[PDB]
From a paper:
Glucuronyl esterases (GEs)4 are enzymes able to cleave ester linkages connecting lignin to glucuronoxylan in the plant cell wall. OtCE15A is an interesting member of CE15 and the α/β-hydrolase superfamily in that it features acidic residues at both the canonical and noncanonical positions (Glu-290 and Asp-356). Here, we have investigated by mutagenesis the residues involved in catalysis and carbohydrate binding in the enzyme OtCE15A and, furthermore, present a series of structures of OtCE15A with different ligands, including monosaccharides and, for the first time in CE15, di- and oligosaccharides.
An S267A-GlcA complex structure was determined to high resolution (1.12 Å) and showed that in the absence of the catalytic serine, the glucuronate binds identically as in the WT protein. However, in the GlcA complex structures, a water molecule is commonly found filling the void left by the absence of methyl substituent and makes a hydrogen bond to the C4 hydroxyl.
Numbering used by the authors: 31 to 432
The structure:
Amino acid sequence: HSAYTLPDPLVGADGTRVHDRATWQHRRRPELLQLFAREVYGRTPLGRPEGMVFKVTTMEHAALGGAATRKEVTVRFGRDPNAPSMQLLLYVPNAVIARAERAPVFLGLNFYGNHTVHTDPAIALSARWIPAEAPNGANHRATEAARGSDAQKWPVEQILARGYAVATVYCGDLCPDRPDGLNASVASWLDAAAGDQRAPDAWGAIGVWAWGLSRALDYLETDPLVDASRVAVHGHARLGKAALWAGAQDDRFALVISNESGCGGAALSKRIHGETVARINTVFPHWFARNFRRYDDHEEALPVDQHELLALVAPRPLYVASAEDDDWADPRGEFLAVKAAEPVFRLFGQTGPSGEDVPRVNEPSGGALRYHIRPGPHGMTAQDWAFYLAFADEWLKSALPA
Ligand SMILES: O=C(O)[C@H]1O[C@H](O)[C@H](O)[C@@H](O)[C@@H]1O
Ligand SMILES: [Mg+2]
């Protein structure tokens, strides 16, 4: 039940206790980032590549019946027109634009293509490979029947009505989610040697997806319609694992949301409940670094656990959420990771969930470090988003002079 012991985020690798925010920021945070890079996700080999190019391919000022401006942007990772790229979809609420104010942004990757997040027939159909599990796909390619096929996870009209822009990119633009996807990924292009077997500490899909989120943020910093200092990075499940790693590595993200990210996301690995290190690496060998396989059936040897990933978001707001029936993600483990990260949030004057057991369903708990568990199976629902929008309202207010 409790057959593990966690490393203390506030004890340095040399045993010295971290007593102050400066030691956390300038020594302990780099230590932990290097541990997760080497042992779990793999190294992010560079941040912004030189020669990133942003091309707005479509712009509609009266999308969604006039409610939004919709922009599609190709973010190309080098100057040569042949360089790899990703396709960003952005809806911005026209009520905010009309007031001549920059909108805060929710940014997250999608599972099956930009055209799946909303029925809107003007969104470009992805030309990229799509998994067999994608609704209404045909031989691994998008079809018009797939439009809006993942819209329940994306309540665009509500987010816009609440004053937030919505930005998304298909994860498969960055690394196709298939065990062979790394060879057709931006990793195959970025700081790679002669294309053979990747190195032990080389990043995999989660690292690549996370890097893509930071490149989307680079684009948002240039877009006059949005406030790139108020970007909430979010993800569901495997894309929440990526949102957490993006938010931990890139402290420009103003707020981070993990929706049911489970093993190698928010859930403690040392708890051995639901999905385990061996199970995740065996089924998804491209997700983590090869070095993470050292801990298959040996989670006791992990030098970190996921509470320390959560702690890397501090002092910025972080929301971890679970589903009651989602045993595979280990909801208790996700909550206990929040509780074990809370001392770092407290060092920074924030507060986490009250209580030392999982709260009752649909009752969020915590300040800037917040948790809820909703009824039902794994997914991302309107109820999850209602809670996330309330959190963002509290923790993403436009900055005024201090
Ligand atoms: O992406 C999802 O929904 C989930 O898919 C699989 O079940 C995987 O085992 C999980 O780690 C992941 O979170
Ligand atoms: Mg688990």
